[PDB]
Design a protein around this ligand. Structure first.
Ligand SMILES: Cc1cn([C@H]2C[C@H](O)[C@@H](COP(=O)(O)OP(=O)(O)O)O2)c(=O)[nH]c1=O
Lengths: 178, 377
């Protein structure tokens, strides 16, 4: 039950020497030749301590699969983000625990997210594997921008105001509506 | 205190893997009194940059360094106080277990590749949390802070200034290589990979107004020079004249003699990472053939150094520099760029000296490794 360090994403948890660490931020960097480096911002899930670690892209870590519960986004308080489940329970999440959602977060977001729990305590929120975003600006593929300002490569057939699908595990274009 | 250091060097290709680790190993023994074991899996490559080395010996002592062949299969031995896997190579599994069976487990360091990109600063000196509890950190060389600095021997720039200010010292060294510069000749060294832009540049040196002496160490670029010279074979000691261009083939020399070669020339064409830095210590204009990577990853690394290196340059000199290096690493098209650089060679030289002297004020990488280990105890 081991995973490659470059396969981890924000919001996931790894078991490192008996300590459960939540990954608040994962960044990929290409070093020399074919080598690569993954920098991680971690937070201990029992003592709360935070640390930064670095791995080879091929290094193997033991993930920890956690409970989940469907949740949706409501508004942005300061400086916390509030999420609500199907039973109108509020979940206030810090900005450091939402680096996976912040890339495609939008006002009035209709996506059905999943809150990651560690012993009945929410630690992060994950977007669905596929999301539907509208293109706010654009000129095989070309550069476009979404309503929240993010930049990603989309199909050249797309235009202003079209609907596209995004794969949140990669943050890349998937398809578009006719 | 005298601590033992294991340095594992995997020669993937070329010579920069063993060049950097040998330079580091030699410096930890000489000016820090450390015990060093240099493990290299391609002893033939080490013998190329160290002529005194025996390429067939399993172990030999050179300049206070214990150089061992990295054999396959690996023979288990005791681990040193510090274990360095250079360039993110993979340690032997049995050696990682020897690192744990000690009163104080070995300090584990990954000496990463050299890059001028900003991301290496946030990763330098960060821990690499191991599932076994071994204390591992990544060590990034760098041109700016924060980083691990650059490899620089004690008194290197002082010896380079005394050498360049002595006409007799420069002529005596060149005479040891069988080289005599003609009056008014411009000296250029050529160390690169297979470069399609080379013949176009040689044509400009051939048709130029000032004569040039191109000193080419034996290597991969010789086939391109021979094709341009239109000769079948180029051997060490050959001298060919093409109008204002003189081409002489030099032998692959010891690492310290390669320094003195770079110190003699007005323009050093270098490559990789070690000779790239060595040309910077020379305080002379530089031409960099960066190691090509997939998906044009090296272009970001080339631009990152250029943006940092061209900070003190005037705008027109910085533009000619970026255009030439880009053409030097991505197909010909450096005609007008070379004409612009050739006109401003004195000014470029003065800025190359300032860049070396400012870099020379930063503590060297070997000293940062010792301070890192001392503060880690
Ligand atoms: C040309 C030459 C290089 N060298 C050394 C300098 C450098 O340490 C090494 C080249 O390493 P480097 O500059 O990193 O480039 P690459 O990895 O592509 O080979 O070879 C010599 O020792 N003698 C020489 O004559």
């Amino acid at each position: 039950h081991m995973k490659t360090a470059q396969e981890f994403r924000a919001g996931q948890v790894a078991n490192i020497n008996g300590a459960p660490w939540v990954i608040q931020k994962a960044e990929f960097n290409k070093s020399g030749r074919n080598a690569a480096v993954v920098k991680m911002k971690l937070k201990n899930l029992l003592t709360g301590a935070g640390t930064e670690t670095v791995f080879k892209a091929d290094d193997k870590l033991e993930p920890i699969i956690l409970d989940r519960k469907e949740v949706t986004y409501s508004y942005f308080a300061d400086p916390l983000y509030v999420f609500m489940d199907s039973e109108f329970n509020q979940y206030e999440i810090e900005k450091d625990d939402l680096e996976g959602v912040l890339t495609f977060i939008e006002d009035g977001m209709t996506d059905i997210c999943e809150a990651v729990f560690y012993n009945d305590k929410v630690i992060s929120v994950e977007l669905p594997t596929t999301i539907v975003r509208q293109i706010a600006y654009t000129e095989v593929m070309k550069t476009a921008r979404l309503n929240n300002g993010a930049e990603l490569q989309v199909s050249a057939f797309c235009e202003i105001g079209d609907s596209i699908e995004i794969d949140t595990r990669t943050g890349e274009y998937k398809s578009r509506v006719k | 205190h005298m601590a033992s250091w294991d340095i594992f060097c995997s020669v993937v290709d070329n010579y920069g893997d063993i060049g950097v680790t040998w330079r580091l190993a030699r410096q930890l023994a000489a000016e820090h009194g450390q015990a060093v074991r240099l493990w290299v899996d391609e002893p033939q490559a080490f013998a190329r940059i160290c002529p005194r080395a025996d390429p067939v010996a399993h172990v030999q002592c050179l300049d206070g360094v214990e150089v061992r062949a990295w054999g396959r299969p690996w023979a288990p031995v005791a681990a040193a106080d510090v274990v360095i896997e250079a360039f993110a190579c993979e340690l032997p599994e049995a050696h990682r277990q020897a690192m744990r069976e000690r009163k104080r487990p070995s300090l584990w360091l990954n000496l990463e590749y050299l890059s001028a990109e900003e991301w290496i600063g946030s990763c330098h000196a960060l821990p690499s949390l191991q599932a076994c509890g071994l204390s591992k950190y990544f060590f990034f060389p760098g041109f700016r802070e924060p980083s691990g600095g650059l490899l620089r021997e004690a008194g290197l720039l002082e010896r380079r200034r005394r050498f360049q200010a002595s006409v007799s010292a420069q002529d005596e060294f060149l005479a040891s290589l069988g080289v005599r510069r003609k009056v008014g000749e411009r000296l250029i060294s050529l160390f690169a990979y297979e470069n399609p832009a080379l013949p176009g540049w040689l044509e400009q040196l051939r048709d130029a107004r000032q004569p040039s002496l191109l000193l080419v160490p034996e290597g991969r670029v010789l086939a391109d020079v021979a094709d341009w010279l239109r000769v079948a074979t180029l051997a060490v000691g050959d001298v060919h004249v093409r109008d204002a261009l003189r081409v002489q083939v030099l032998p692959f020399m010891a690492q310290d003699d390669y320094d003195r070669l770079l110190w003699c020339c007005d323009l050093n064409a270098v490559r990789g990472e070690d000779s790239f830095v060595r040309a910077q210590w020379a305080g002379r204009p530089l031409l960099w053939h960066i190691y090509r990577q997939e998906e044009e990853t090296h272009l970001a690394k080339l631009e990152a150094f250029l943006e940092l290196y061209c900070a003190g340059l005037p705008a027109d000199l910085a533009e000619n520099l970026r255009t030439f290096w880009l053409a030097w690493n991505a197909g010909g098209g450096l005609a007008g760029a070379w004409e612009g650089l050739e006109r401003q060679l004195p000014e470029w030289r003065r800025e190359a000296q300032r860049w070396a002297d400012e870099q020379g004020m930063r503590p060297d990488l070997a000293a940062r490794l010792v301070q890192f280990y001392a503060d880690w105890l």
